[PDB]
């Protein structure tokens, strides 16, 4: 026989969304009488986008019994109509075994972990609760973006733990760590063919992102990851934006700008595009063929801005193939329209590699 749904603990209900933030609630609640139950940051809340605060329960000995009573009787709390399910990416906290810290970003710590069910190693991005509300409201962007994608050179989303605090975004673990560190530790033994393959991987990922109308905005060696087989994957989509018509205009307040990787029109006018990511790609090429040198090492960020405005660019690294440097130079055209596309860049890199 079957256990009735209403006899199940709240924790198990498809329409219990736990620690789902407000922004997400409003998105999920679409039609009249759509509803879900969630927890207040011991109060539970029946959201229908009206928010009704819930040993009995009312507005029954359990909350599922209350919802069923309401739904089945159409009694006014507003009348409930349709319970709204968690989407397929939601993962319970108990499905994840958290491990040690592996990095930090502007939202807080990143940890390794394992899925309890099959031991899959994962990366777990966390959000510090003490951050400003406008920032915390952006935390789930990386999940919203990555839910849509599947590519060998893009970090895979595994799940989202929004049933309780602290909220996590769970992704594949790319076990060789960041590409900048990789270049600085392994660089002396790396062949040029390998470097070409790895920036080829990056170009493949970026071509994919352009095809999805995604603008990354923080492309750099530090934000790419390397597998144990030297495959490169693009990560840290915290700054990324999706724009159907190709341009993201910076909104409003202060921004964190990685100045030495950022195109002039992005840095000074907040015009971001696949073209501005192409500039960043050129910097990534320079990082790679210099085996992890810091760009413009003798200039502060303000100085680099002025240097670049005057037509200054990074020098050719020693032993960088000439076709690779020419491509860099094209990536750093002042006018965004004069830069090559990621499709063009990937083709060129594949051509250069095949001739090596």
């Amino acid at each position: 026989s079957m256990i009735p749904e209403v006899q199940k603990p709240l924790h198990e209900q498809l329409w219990y969304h736990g620690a789902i933030p407000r922004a997400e609630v409003a998105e999920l609640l679409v039609h009249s009488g759509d509803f879900l139950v969630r927890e207040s940051q011991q109060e539970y809340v029946l959201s229908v986008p009206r928010h009704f605060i819930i040993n009995l329960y009312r507005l029954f000995p359990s909350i599922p019994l209350l919802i069923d009573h309401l739904l089945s009787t159409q009694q006014p709390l507003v009348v409930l109509h349709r319970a709204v399910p968690k989407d397929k990416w939601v993962l319970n906290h108990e499905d994840l075994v958290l491990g040690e810290q592996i990095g930090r970003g502007n939202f807080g710590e990143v940890f390794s972990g394992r899925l309890r069910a099959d031991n899959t190693l994962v990366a777990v991005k966390s959000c510090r609760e003490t951050l400003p509300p406008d920032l915390k409201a952006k935390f789930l962007q990386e999940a919203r973006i990555l839910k849509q994608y599947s590519h060998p050179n893009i970090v895979r989303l595994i799940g989202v733990c929004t049933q309780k605090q602290p909220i996590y975004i769970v992704m594949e673990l790319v076990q060789g760590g960041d590409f900048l560190t990789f270049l600085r530790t392994e660089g002396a033994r790396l062949r040029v063919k390998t470097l070409l393959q790895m920036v080829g991987d990056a170009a493949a990922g970026m071509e994919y992102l352009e095809s999805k109308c995604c603008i990354h905005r923080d492309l750099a060696a530090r934000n790419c990851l390397v597998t144990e087989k030297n495959v490169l994957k693009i990560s840290d989509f915290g700054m990324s934006r999706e724009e159907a018509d190709g341009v993201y205009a910076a909104s409003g307040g202060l921004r964190q700008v990685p100045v030495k990787w950022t195109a002039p029109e992005a840095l000074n006018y907040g015009r971001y595009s696949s073209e501005s990511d192409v500039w960043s790609f050129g910097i990534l090429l320079w990082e790679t063929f210099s085996l992890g040198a810091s760009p413009y090492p003798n200039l502060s960020n303000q100085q680099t801005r002025e240097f670049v405005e005057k037509g200054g660019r990074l020098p050719c690294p020693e032993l960088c193939p000439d076709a690779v440097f020419r491509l860099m130079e094209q990536c750093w055209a002042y006018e965004p329209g004069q830069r090559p596309s990621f499709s063009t860049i990937y083709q060129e890199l594949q051509s250069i590699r095949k001739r090596h």
């Binding site: 964190q256 700008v257 990685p258």
Partner: peptide, 5 residues
């Protein structure tokens, strides 16, 4: 690397 601007 990052500047708030």
């Amino acid at each position: 690397i990052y500047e708030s601007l």
